[PDB]
Amino acid sequence: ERDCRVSSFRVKENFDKARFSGTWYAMAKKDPEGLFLQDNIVAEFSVDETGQMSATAKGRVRLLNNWDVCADMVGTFTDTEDPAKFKMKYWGVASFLQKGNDDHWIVDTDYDTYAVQYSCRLLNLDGTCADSYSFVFSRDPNGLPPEAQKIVRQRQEELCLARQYRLIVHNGYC
Ligand SMILES: CCCCCCCCCCCCCCCC(=O)O
Ligand SMILES: [Cl-]
Numbered sequence: 001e002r003d004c005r006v007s008s009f010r011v012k013e014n015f016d017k018a019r020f021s022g023t024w025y026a027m028a029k030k031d032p033e034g035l036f037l038q039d040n041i042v043a044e045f046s047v048d049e050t051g052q053m054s055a056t057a058k059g060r061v062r063l064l065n066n067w068d069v070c071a072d073m074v075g076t077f078t079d080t081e082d083p084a085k086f087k088m089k090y091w092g093v094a095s096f097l098q099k100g101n102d103d104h105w106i107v108d109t110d111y112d113t114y115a116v117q118y119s120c121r122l123l124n125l126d127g128t129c130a131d132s133y134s135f136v137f138s139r140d141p142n143g144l145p146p147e148a149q150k151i152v153r154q155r156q157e158e159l160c161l162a163r164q165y166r167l168i169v170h171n172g173y174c
């Protein structure tokens with residue numbers, strides 16, 4: 001019944017980059033293929049006088065054969081016609097860390113409590129996403145209040161991802 005075409009997904013109306021700046025703690029993640037960020041994921045968003053949004057991120061990533069490593073990542077956001085949809089160029093402060101360019105959608109936020117992010121890296125031929133990821137962010141590292149949690153669950157369902165998240169632990173690894 002529900003529409004899982006990426007083109008149907010609502011995003012944050014009149015998204016305000018300035019209000020979004022600051023520290024966001026990842027509480028949950030839906031992983032893409034070949035997942036990168038594992039846990040202890042903390043993002044820091046900024047916007048400059050030109051209105052350009054950028055971010056940094058720390059988090060544990062586990063390179064294969066079980067090598068752990070606290071990644072330090074950088075992202076810069078190119079605006080689109082939709083104020084809540086961006087193109088995010090990202091790289092690590094170390095050369096060997098994953099780089100690339102992903103869609104970055106702010107699906108919903110209230111700026112001071114929760115945020116829901118979404119990226120479709122590759123569409124299916126029917127307009128659904130073949131390879132997606134999504135972060136749920138909290139301003140408080142101890143988690144969302146119940147009212148925000150319930151709003152987020154609804155947004156998760158609207159993205160057709162509600163069954164596919166895992167919790168992100170924070171234990172001072174970094
Ligand atoms: C989407 C991260 C929130 C914004 C922080 C941008 C800092 C660069 C982010 C690198 C994350 C790109 C990899 C996400 C997919 C994954 O972790 O498996
Ligand atoms: Cl609930």
Ligand SMILES: [Cl-]
Pocket residue numbers: 162163164
């Ligand atoms: Cl579920």
